[PDB]
Amino acid sequence: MVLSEGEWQLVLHVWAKVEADVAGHGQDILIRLFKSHPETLEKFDRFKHLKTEAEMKASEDLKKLGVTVLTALGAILKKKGHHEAELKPLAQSHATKHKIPIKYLEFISEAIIHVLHSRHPGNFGADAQGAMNKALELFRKDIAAKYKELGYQG
Numbered sequence: 185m186v187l188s189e190g191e192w193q194l195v196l197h198v199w200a201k202v203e204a205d206v207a208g209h210g211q212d213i214l215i216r217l218f219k220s221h222p223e224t225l226e227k228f229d230r231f232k233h234l235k236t237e238a239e240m241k242a243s244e245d246l247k248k249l250g251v252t253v254l255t256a257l258g259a260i261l262k263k264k265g266h267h268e269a270e271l272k273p274l275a276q277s278h279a280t281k282h283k284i285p286i287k288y289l290e291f292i293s294e295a296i297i298h299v300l301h302s303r304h305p306g307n308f309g310a311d312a313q314g315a316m317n318k319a320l321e322l323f324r325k326d327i328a329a330k331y332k333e334l335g336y337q338g
């Protein structure tokens with residue numbers, strides 16, 4: 185697929201608002217993900233012992249991971265489709281070391297969209313949401329293809 189520039193502009197415009205508080209957004213998104221799809225929490229050895237959302241909010245480690253995840257995603261979206269290099273190490277670690285199925289990347293894509301929708305309604309109307317969804321579907325499509333070359337496809 186290929187986004188138009190206009191679509192990239194809608195995606196990077198709301199992203200610039202996310203970047204005003206990267207740790208807060210990273211917490212909100214990971215907690216929305218673990219509440220909605222608790223099985224995903226099992227992939228995190230360091231955190232699968234967290235029992236409630238209060239514990240998750242209080243975890244310093246969880247907040248640090250959130251910033252790591254959002255910072256890598258932001259770097260990929262800022263490429264505007266030219267993200268082959270950025271994707272290579274990401275695909276390798278998520279396919280061989282962590283073993284994250286494509287289905288789980290769809291789940292965090294749903295959590296990202298839910299959080300931007302609640303925190304940025306003015307910059308995340310239907311056209312902006314459609315553009316962010318296209319950008320995350322492109323991201324998932326390119327990572328799924330890399331998973332296949334690497335021998336995981338899952």
Ligand code: HEM
Binds near residue numbers: 225229253274278288
């Ligand atoms: C928007 C998509 C995501 C991005 C951009 C991303 C980014 C990252 C990055 C940059 C790291 C640190 C270096 C590395 O190991 O690659 C990481 C680690 C990790 N990620 Fe992902 N990730 C994403 C989705 C997920 C999902 C959906 C899961 C599981 C449901 C996941 C599981 C993990 C695990 C288990 C680690 C190691 C955490 C720790 O160090 O204990 N990631 N991820």
